[PDB]
Amino acid sequence: GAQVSSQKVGAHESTINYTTINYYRDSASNAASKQDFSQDPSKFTEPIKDVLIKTAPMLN
Amino acid sequence: GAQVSSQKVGAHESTINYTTINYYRDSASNAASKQDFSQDPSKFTEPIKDVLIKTAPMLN
Amino acid sequence: GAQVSSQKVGAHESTINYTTINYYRDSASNAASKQDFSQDPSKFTEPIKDVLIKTAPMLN
Amino acid sequence: GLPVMNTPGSNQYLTADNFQSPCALPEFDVTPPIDIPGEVKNMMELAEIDTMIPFDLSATKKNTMEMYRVRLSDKPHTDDPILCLSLSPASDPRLSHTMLGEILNYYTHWAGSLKFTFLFCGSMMATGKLLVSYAPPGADPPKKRKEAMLGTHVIWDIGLQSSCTMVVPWISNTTYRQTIDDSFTEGGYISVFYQTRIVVPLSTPREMDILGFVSACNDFSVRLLRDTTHIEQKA
Amino acid sequence: GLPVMNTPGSNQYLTADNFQSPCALPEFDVTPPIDIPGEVKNMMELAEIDTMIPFDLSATKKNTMEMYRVRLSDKPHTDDPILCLSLSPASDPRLSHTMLGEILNYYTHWAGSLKFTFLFCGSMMATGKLLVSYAPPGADPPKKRKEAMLGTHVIWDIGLQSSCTMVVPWISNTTYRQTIDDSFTEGGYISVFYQTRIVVPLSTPREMDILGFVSACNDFSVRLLRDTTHIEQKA
Amino acid sequence: GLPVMNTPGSNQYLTADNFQSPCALPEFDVTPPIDIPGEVKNMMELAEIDTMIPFDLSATKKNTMEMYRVRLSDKPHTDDPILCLSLSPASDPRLSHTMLGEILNYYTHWAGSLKFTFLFCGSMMATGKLLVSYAPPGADPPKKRKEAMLGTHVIWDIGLQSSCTMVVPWISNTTYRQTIDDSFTEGGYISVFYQTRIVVPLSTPREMDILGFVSACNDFSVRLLRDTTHIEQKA
Amino acid sequence: EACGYSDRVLQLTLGNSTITTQEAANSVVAYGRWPEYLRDSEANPVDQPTEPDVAACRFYTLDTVSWTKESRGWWWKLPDALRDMGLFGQNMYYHYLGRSGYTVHVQCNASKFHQGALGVFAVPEMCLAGDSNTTTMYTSYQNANPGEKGGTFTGTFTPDNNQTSPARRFCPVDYLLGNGTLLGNAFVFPHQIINLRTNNCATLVLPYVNSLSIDSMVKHNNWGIAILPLAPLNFASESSPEIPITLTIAPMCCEFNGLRNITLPRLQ
Amino acid sequence: GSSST
Amino acid sequence: GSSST
Amino acid sequence: GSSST
Amino acid sequence: AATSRDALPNTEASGPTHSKEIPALTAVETGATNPLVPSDTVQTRHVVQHRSRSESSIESFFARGACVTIMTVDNSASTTNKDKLFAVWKITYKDTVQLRRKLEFFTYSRFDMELTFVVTANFTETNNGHALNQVYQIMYVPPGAPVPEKWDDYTWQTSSNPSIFYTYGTAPARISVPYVGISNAYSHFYDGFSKVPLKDQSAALGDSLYGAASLNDFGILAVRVVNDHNPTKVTSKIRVYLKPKHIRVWCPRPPRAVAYYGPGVDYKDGTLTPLSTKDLTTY
Numbered sequence A, B, C: 001g002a003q004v005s006s007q008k009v010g011a012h013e014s015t016i017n018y019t020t021i022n023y024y025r026d027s028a029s030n031a032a033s034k035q036d037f038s039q040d041p042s043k044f045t046e047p048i049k050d051v052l053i054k055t056a057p058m059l060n
Numbered sequence D, E, F: 001g002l003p004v005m006n007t008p009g010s011n012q013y014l015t016a017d018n019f020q021s022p023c024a025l026p027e028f029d030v031t032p033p034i035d036i037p038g039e040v041k042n043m044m045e046l047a048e049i050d051t052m053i054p055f056d057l058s059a060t061k062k063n064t065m066e067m068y069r070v071r072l073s074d075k076p077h078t079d080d081p082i083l084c085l086s087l088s089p090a091s092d093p094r095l096s097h098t099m100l101g102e103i104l105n106y107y108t109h110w111a112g113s114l115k116f117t118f119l120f121c122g123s124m125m126a127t128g129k130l131l132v133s134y135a136p137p138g139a140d141p142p143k144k145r146k147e148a149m150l151g152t153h154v155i156w157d158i159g160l161q162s163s164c165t166m167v168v169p170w171i172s173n174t175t176y177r178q179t180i181d182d183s184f185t186e187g188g189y190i191s192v193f194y195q196t197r198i199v200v201p202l203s204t205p206r207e208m209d210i211l212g213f214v215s216a217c218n219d220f221s222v223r224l225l226r227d228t229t230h231i232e233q234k235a
Numbered sequence G: 001e002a003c004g005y006s007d008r009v010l011q012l013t014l015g016n017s018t019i020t021t022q023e024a025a026n027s028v029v030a031y032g033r034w035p036e037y038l039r040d041s042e043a044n045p046v047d048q049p050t051e052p053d054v055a056a057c058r059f060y061t062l063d064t065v066s067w068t069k070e071s072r073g074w075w076w077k078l079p080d081a082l083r084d085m086g087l088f089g090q091n092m093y094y095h096y097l098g099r100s101g102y103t104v105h106v107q108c109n110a111s112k113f114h115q116g117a118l119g120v121f122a123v124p125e126m127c128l129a130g131d132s133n134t135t136t137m138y139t140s141y142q143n144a145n146p147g148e149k150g151g152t153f154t155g156t157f158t159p160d161n162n163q164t165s166p167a168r169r170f171c172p173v174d175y176l177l178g179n180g181t182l183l184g185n186a187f188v189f190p191h192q193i194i195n196l197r198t199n200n201c202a203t204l205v206l207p208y209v210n211s212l213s214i215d216s217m218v219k220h221n222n223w224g225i226a227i228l229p230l231a232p233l234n235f236a237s238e239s240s241p242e243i244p245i246t247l248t249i250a251p252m253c254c255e256f257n258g259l260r261n262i263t264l265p266r267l268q
Numbered sequence H, I, J: 001g002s003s004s005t
Numbered sequence K: 001a002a003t004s005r006d007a008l009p010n011t012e013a014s015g016p017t018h019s020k021e022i023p024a025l026t027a028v029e030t031g032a033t034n035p036l037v038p039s040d041t042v043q044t045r046h047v048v049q050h051r052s053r054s055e056s057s058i059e060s061f062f063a064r065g066a067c068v069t070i071m072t073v074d075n076s077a078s079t080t081n082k083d084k085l086f087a088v089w090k091i092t093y094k095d096t097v098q099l100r101r102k103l104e105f106f107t108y109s110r111f112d113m114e115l116t117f118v119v120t121a122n123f124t125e126t127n128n129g130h131a132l133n134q135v136y137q138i139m140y141v142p143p144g145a146p147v148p149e150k151w152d153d154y155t156w157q158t159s160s161n162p163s164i165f166y167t168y169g170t171a172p173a174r175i176s177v178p179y180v181g182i183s184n185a186y187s188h189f190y191d192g193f194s195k196v197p198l199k200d201q202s203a204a205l206g207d208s209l210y211g212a213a214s215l216n217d218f219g220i221l222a223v224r225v226v227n228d229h230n231p232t233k234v235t236s237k238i239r240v241y242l243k244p245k246h247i248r249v250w251c252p253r254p255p256r257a258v259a260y261y262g263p264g265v266d267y268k269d270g271t272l273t274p275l276s277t278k279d280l281t282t283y
């Protein structure tokens, strides 16, 4: 049941990996994976009904 | 995710190996591998533009 | 990287084995295997230039 | 038992650690998520939203609505600044409280390009050209259009497109700047000038406000998480 | 972290343990071995080398060179012993300091066959027959040739082969004997007698010495390591 | 939990250990490296660079620029030494502060070949032959050319190739020498003599300096890391 | 070479300028790295760089100094020594950021009857020690940056005892390389020696070196040039000989970012 | 057994 | 799983 | 992985 | 592919020579060191070399924890003219000398930093009394975060700063930190200023220390005893050990030869005579 993932290596001395085994039945007991996703800011930065083309007039 | 490497054995009693597993996501948490490289001293010992041949006159 | 060897079993209750993993890069950190060899005592008990046959006269 | 040797760090509590721990409510029936609108995945998403700058922190205008209003008028052309600002997004008092400034005060280091957008709020009948400037650090901070023009700038023509944006490109010696006032990692000078002048017809207000906004570009990032000075709890 | 439960023995220091431990000199450049002569792999190799017995520990001969010399002479035949010795290789004072005796004093138990070799050091002109005896324990210790002959023995004829060996075969009730004086694990009696007599011509020394040596056979072993009583450190 | 038994060494802090430990700044955005020139991979690379020897540590010349200058002159031939030096690269006061000497003072043991190079700094018109010597230890240290010639040496002819090198070959009883003054691991004697004499024409300086340099060969190594005596911190 | 090419005879040409030498001792490329422009994978400021090329990457000759029996040594900092040199200096003061490599050519000829030896060292981050034992790190910008005239070394440390009006200058002691380390070890830095019997010049090609891809040339010097008499000047039997030393330096692969109005520094 | 990410 | 050096 | 003695 | 633990080159056997090849003659003016080996100037035998440079790799040379500071705290009643003592330390390797000298063999470096904390306590007053086992809080406050003014103020809440709560008598505390520099490498030497003095500005306004870059380079460690005070006074000290793991270094330098005198390269009068008397022709 071991999960093997890669580290993003900062300062250096191949891919270096690390291992993780969950010891408990409840997912709430798990550590945080930090393997997170990013999304585009559009729902906050461009919430307009008509798609904005930046080279065009915003008002036409 | 185990990394198996060999020891250089000094005093003796095959290849003896040792095992390493990284327990953390950040490479900064890792121990030092001590598997390091050597380089030639030339950039400090012979920084001259024209390659030195030791049997030849250094000044010609 | 696990080393599996057999025990010589003294008092009894197949081959029973035991496991060993080296945790360190330096062989000096390792435990002793106790898997040692024996040799014949001849270099101390019979250091003579001419091979001794025990049924024969030692002096002929 | 398995032979073990306790290492340094044993039994400490690091508040930044990331370990497993036992669950106090085993087999709890968790309520499922629903698809609530407005989910955020990264704090830099918030830094990319334009928020309004409190430019005029005069003793009488600060901590009032007036601090957000930069007054212009139709006076004869001058080469003197409408406003002057230091590019210290976490520490200059005009930038530190913007949403960008606030998020930067939870981090030690920032990097990347920024952008300033100005909104003209005079009447439709009012016209004008302004010069918006960014001077990278190291010389005398611009106090005259003559110097400001020599740096990064946008000449803004007022018209139907109400607003104009100047991008402050990432131009730095270091790979990240500090989120405090620091000479070694100083960012330079933002300023605004009259290019021609504001002109109005008769029957029109001769003075008006512009509003300014700051936000991060897609190449902007922060690091080294830290506590902010922007909130406290005495007693 | 991984759930663990500390067992008895935890944190103790057993001087006989065999664990790994951190290296204080990491990446040290070790000097390679060279092939030095005389390598030993097992202490029983040393026990198989003949060393000389201090047979005559009389008050005036002990702790002098004389203790190693057993005096014979050309006197008329007698059935009386030249020497008498207990087979207690670690505890009898004549055997305990031989190399075999010394190694046995670092162990609690010994087992296997031994051998005694005698060297005649009289002149070439001297002749003689001697009887070397081993009596396994349990009867009266031999004080006369009559009894000694009934046990394990070798009749030694003196001549060009200078020396003679009697093997004391492993004959024991227990599988190992104790390395102390102990009646239950007693080994029996070693003795030497005149079989005929030493005879010399005229112009020849009428008295001479024999020297004796003890060593282990290839079936000999020891166990249960222990400290010796043969060295101390007062204050 | 998993049954475990704590071993000796548990909870200690060995300053030379090599374990993992938790990161206090998780997911930190590290700045990438750039290809800075002059990267070093091993301290022996620095030991292979020639550095200048402070040969003349007289009371008035030491701790001044003069200590690096060895004065020669055009005087009549003599068999007396220009300089005498002990091959104790970490402890002789003339060698201990060279870059080689300094690195050796962070280690207990050294091994390998060394080389001394001398630079003639007189005028082009000056000529001369010198004898540079290495005497392995164990005899009277050379005070006359007669003895120095019998050891390892180079007869240097001064000319267009300004400099000359004598290699001190690794010649030792032990596999490594100590980095302190120690008779058992002594290295022997370096010395320089006039082979003929310095000769100059008229209108020329009759005295001049030579400078000397020491560096390690490719077979040179050190081990057992240690603190140096070459820096301290009182109070 | 059988066509005559020599280690000793070189010609260097950069921009509209050429140096010839007939008594060189080869030439050095510091750390074996030739100067280069900033690569995209190492780039940091995003604005289009200026690269003046031949207008700035050419040989500039600084004021000639004089070597005598009493000389203890000289030092210069780069880019400081070139701050007033033609369009290189202009580009430097007009931009926040700038990076540059250099060809350094030290010139000193004498005669077959003179003798002496100059150690010529190029030191990355050549931090020098100050004149004060009342305040550390106190050398003023003005005294740290002499421009083309450079500074000098001294054989004696002498602490500034004026506390009212501190001199705020360096006091770089020669055998301590002006920085608390022994001069005999300065050979681990890229160097050449002008030994008058052998050669009449030193040539060092220096890459841009820094812990950053680009930085403030006005705030920070990347390289220091230290010239010290390893063996003192001497001639015939004259008690007071003199020979000149001339420094000619050329910037190489220099590029600049962050254009604004010109910097006008307080240099006195 | 093992999962790889 | 395992890596060998 | 494993070695057997 | 040549590793730090590889054996160095064998000595090859070499015999007598008489030729125009001149290895021994050279010219140090060029700036080069003559690459000779024993077989170039003497007759050699063949030797199979087993020695290696494993212990002098940059990693191995630095692979040790060094003390960089001692912080003092107490657990006393705060009273109107004196408060309970907590400690504040500006993170640096320049308060002590040994690790500083080793790092300064080089101009620049990159490394992951391992910090280990050794904590010791004692009673200071005579009285009998007691204290119960202390817990310590070691809080990192990075440049810009609120530095604590009192042992018990709001900043010790640490919602974002990393803190270690260490229990007295347990194993020394330890954490790692990545390469956190705002440059591509740490500068052990910065020949510059953090400010340009402008002519149009006052001298005071353009002034800055020589060789100093960011005034608060790396922030501070703030340490306190978390326990409330006892009737009896207990003083504690936190010794901080720094080890540079996963290290790279650039541009070698001559080592410090005279005593350190401040965070810069400055030296003190009276300390400038490292070398000792020894006669030129005396072994």
Ligand SMILES: CCCCCCCCCCCCC/C=C\[C@H](O)[C@H](N)CO
Pocket (backbone or CB within 6 Å): F024, K091, K092, K093, K113, K115, K138, K139, K140, K162, K163, K164, K175, K177, K180, K186, K187, K188, K189, K217, K218
């Ligand atoms: C809970 C405790 C966390 C402690 C975190 C400490 C983080 C800050 C580390 C700073 C790194 C310092 C490295 C050494 C100094 C510099 O290299 C030199 N002055 C050169 O720039």
Ligand SMILES: *C(=O)CCCCCCCCCCCCC
Pocket (backbone or CB within 6 Å): A001, A002, A021, A022, A023, A024, H001, H002
């Ligand atoms: C998947 O996990 C199969 C491999 C098992 C590897 C060794 C597990 C180490 C100890 C796990 C204890 C589990 C805790 C309840």
Ligand SMILES: *C(=O)CCCCCCCCCCCCC
Pocket (backbone or CB within 6 Å): A002, A004, A019, A020, A021, B001, B002, B021, B022, B023, B024, H002, I001, I002
């Ligand atoms: C690769 O790692 C697969 C093999 C797993 C071997 C057993 C792992 C032992 C316990 C690992 C704990 C990991 C720490 C978060």
Ligand SMILES: *C(=O)CCCCCCCCCCCCC
Pocket (backbone or CB within 6 Å): B002, B004, B019, B020, B021, C001, C002, C021, C022, C023, C024, I002, J001, J002
């Ligand atoms: C070979 O070792 C591959 C199998 C790995 C088995 C589990 C290892 C258990 C934990 C090892 C820790 C290593 C110590 C640095």
